[PDB]
Ligand binder design. Structure first.
Ligand SMILES: O=C(O)c1cc2c(c3c1c([N+](=O)[O-])cc1ccccc13)OCO2
Ligand SMILES: O=C(O)c1cc2c(c3c1c([N+](=O)[O-])cc1ccccc13)OCO2
Ligand SMILES: CCCCCCCCCCCCCC(=O)O
Ligand SMILES: CCCCCCCCCCCCCC(=O)O
Ligand SMILES: CCCCCCCCCCCCCC(=O)O
Ligand SMILES: CCCCCCCCCCCCCC(=O)O
Ligand SMILES: CCCCCCCCCCCCCC(=O)O
Ligand SMILES: CCCCCCCCCCCCCC(=O)O
Length: 582
């Protein structure tokens, strides 16, 4: 178009345009105050309106990258605040934009965002809704500078809905706080999955990513032909390749192009896309990314015909090995939306290993005739793991389920920092409560998506301050093998029990007046420390100390001299436990 800024303004609408301009500036200029950014947005928006009124007005024909770069280089504090980044202004495009991307700071060292009191938030929301929400959008964007801006805008709108509902409700905090907890977790997860996809693309390569995409789209679009799934896989891998490079505009265009193609070819792809494809440009690709699986065709044949029984297996394989393997994955994935993607990838890797070995024998058919028997234990392992864990979760409930995992995992990797052991076990308990509520058919995909997040949260923390060779091995192995590796960890036999420390197991009256969450973490922290000191304690011995501890807290909270009860009966609890263990 003659004026790309006018085209964006008309396509997005003013409100959306202004919010995305704020995010973009915040993600590049992560240290400038909110008020500086608001002025930039207003200036850009007033310029944009000139172009909408006259596409041939001055500078309206300039590229969005040129205009955006020119505006960054007008920031007066650019060299004093960002130093080296101000030298990108001496360059011409496209080198100037590439230079700017290189100086995005993923660890900007900003203070943690403190959640205000419910009444305080609801009052700010009423008195200045836009400043309240937009400031938070700026705070989140500068802290997550690679977070795809449209999706950040989508979260902002869900927050707005939470505040308009709950701030006019009788019990505001009971309404609002769980909504903010759930939204924060979702945003954390979404951010983590974006980073995970890019990290995996670079380490393991384009081929491995295309395999993941073949499985993902085949489950989603089971009625589409292989050739159509494979075309979509190529474009999706290009979308993620570009998007991981970090250029928002290039990422947005590539995504809009794929959404446009998908929506123009619904009849060849899926019957679930009609609603997404009626949505505005801004939301189309995100809607499609989250579309529900289409219903699979009825009476699909067994895979044994084309992949086991046919005389042409090795011939078809050797002609074009990745196309044949992609076809195997497509046929398996479309039939099993109830599998994790990595499970489907394990089956493809198993089939490939068998074909490489067998097609070289004189009688390949005999060699690979039982290959579908090798899939059975691979399928059953996560299936059984899900059944066992969900049944234990129903028996124990979320808190006690977290403590079951806390003990188990402290014993396997006692060297991990106690805060990390608590957070990971807590989050894994949340995966149980979320996914176990699903029917069996959807449990394993649910578990995979949330475990990907939790386990990479563990890996990156460990990466920063490593402690255990076994955790680094599971974190650096095949992502397809990441979950089985963590599951195969055994109790650390060579761990030297940590030395007793008195104040670690000293408790005060503050525990009674703490929030339920902080009291849970306080107790979970001490349970980890208990196992790190007595790693060989049996489950009976541990339950007894936990039962003793529970009596000690409820007796000393109702005590009228609370402080001395906690000290006196605490010395008793510790001395009794030190003899009931070891
Ligand atoms: O934990 C935070 O600091 C945090 C606090 C928050 C959030 C988010 C947060 C994060 N995070 O993990 O940084 C990611 C997010 C990703 C998308 C959307 C929102 C958030 O929106 C309101 O208060
Ligand atoms: O990668 C995925 O999980 C994903 C899965 C998908 C997709 C898309 C996906 C993504 N993504 O990045 O999420 C972006 C997209 C952008 C434009 C069009 C489609 C998609 O359409 C169906 O299955
Ligand atoms: C993309 C996010 C846009 C706005 C999100 C914040 C809206 C106000 C709620 C912030 C309160 C703190 C949230 C928290 O710490 O859990
Ligand atoms: C200088 C960049 C900010 C102004 C232009 C931002 C345009 C973002 C496009 C958002 C629409 C994406 C559509 C999609 O994801 O499919
Ligand atoms: C569209 C190309 C599909 C190619 C299929 C490759 C064969 C499937 C095996 C997948 C192995 C992935 C390696 C890994 O990440 O562990
Ligand atoms: C409490 C943990 C969540 C519920 C049980 C999950 C079962 C283990 C993982 C299942 C499969 C994950 C993806 C995979 O490895 O194939
Ligand atoms: C925090 C360091 C220890 C991390 C322990 C690995 C977590 C195991 C994930 C594998 C599936 C979890 C469900 C299960 O307990 O079987
Ligand atoms: C040497 C150990 C001294 C005794 C201290 C016991 C600390 C164990 C904390 C038990 C936490 C589990 C209780 C709960 O979650 O309700």
């Amino acid at each position: 178009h003659k004026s790309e800024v006018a085209h964006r303004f008309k396509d997005l609408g003013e409100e959306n345009f202004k919010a995305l301009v704020l995010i973009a500036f915040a993600q590049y200029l992560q240290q400038c105050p909110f008020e500086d950014h608001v002025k930039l947005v207003n200036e850009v928006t007033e310029f944009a309106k000139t172009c909408v009124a006259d596409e041939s007005a001055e500078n309206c024909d300039k590229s969005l990258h040129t205009l955006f770069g020119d505006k960054l280089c007008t920031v007066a504090t650019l060299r004093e605040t960002y130093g080296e980044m101000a030298d990108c202004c001496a360059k011409q495009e496209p080198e100037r934009n590439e230079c700017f991307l290189q100086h995005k700071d993923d660890n900007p060292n900003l203070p943690r965002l403190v959640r205000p009191e419910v009444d305080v938030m609801c009052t700010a929301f009423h008195d200045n809704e836009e400043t309240f929400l937009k400031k938070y959008l700026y705070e989140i964007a500068r802290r997550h500078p690679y977070f795809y801006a449209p999706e950040l805008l989508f979260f902002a709108k869900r927050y707005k809905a939470a505040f308009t509902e709950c701030c006019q409700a009788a019990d505001k905090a009971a309404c609002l706080l769980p909504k903010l907890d759930e939204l924060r977790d979702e945003g954390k997860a979404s951010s983590a999955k974006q980073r995970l996809k890019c990290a995996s693309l670079q380490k393991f390569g384009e081929r491995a990513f295309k395999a993941w995409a073949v499985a993902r789209l085949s489950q989603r679009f089971p009625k589409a032909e292989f050739a159509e799934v494979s075309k979509l896989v190529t474009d999706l891998t290009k979308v993620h390749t570009e998007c991981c490079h970090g250029d928002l505009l290039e990422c947005a265009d590539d995504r809009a192009d794929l959404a446009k193609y998908i929506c123009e070819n619904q009849d060849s792809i899926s019957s679930k896309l009609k609603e997404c494809c009626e949505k505005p440009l801004l939301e189309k690709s995100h809607c499609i990314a989250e579309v529900e699986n289409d219903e699979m065709p009825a009476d699909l044949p067994s895979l044994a015909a084309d992949f086991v029984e046919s005389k042409d297996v090795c011939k078809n394989y050797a002609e074009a090995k990745d196309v044949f393997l992609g076809m195997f994955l497509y046929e398996y994935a479309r039939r099993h939306p109830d599998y994790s993607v990595v499970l489907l990838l394990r089956l493809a890797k198993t089939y490939e290993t068998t074909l490489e070995k067998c097609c070289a024998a004189a009688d390949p058919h005999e060699c690979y005739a039982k290959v579908f028997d090798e899939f059975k234990p691979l399928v059953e392992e996560p299936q059984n793991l899900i059944k066992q864990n969900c049944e234990l979760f129903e028996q124990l409930g979320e808190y006690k389920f977290q403590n079951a995992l806390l003990v188990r995992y402290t014993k396997k990797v006692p060297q991990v920092s106690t805060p990390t052991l608590v957070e990971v076990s807590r989050n894994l308990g949340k995966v149980g409560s979320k996914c176990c509520k699903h029917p069996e058919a959807k449990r394993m995909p649910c578990a995979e998506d949330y475990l990907s997040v939790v386990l990479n949260q563990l890996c990156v923390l460990h990466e920063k301050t490593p402690v255990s060779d076994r955790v680094t091995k599971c974190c650096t192995e095949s992502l397809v093998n990441r979950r089985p590796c963590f599951s195969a960890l055994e109790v650390d036999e060579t761990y030297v029990p940590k030395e007793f420390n008195a104040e670690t197991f000293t408790f005060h009256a503050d525990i009674c007046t703490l929030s339920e969450k902080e009291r849970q973490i306080k107790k979970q922290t001490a349970l980890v420390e208990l196992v790190k000191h007595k790693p060989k304690a049996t489950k009976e011995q541990l339950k007894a100390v936990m039962d003793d501890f529970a009596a000690f807290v409820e007796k000393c909270c109702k005590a009228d001299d609370k402080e001395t009860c906690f000290a006196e009966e605490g010395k008793k609890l510790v001395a009794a436990s030190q003899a009931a263990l070891g």
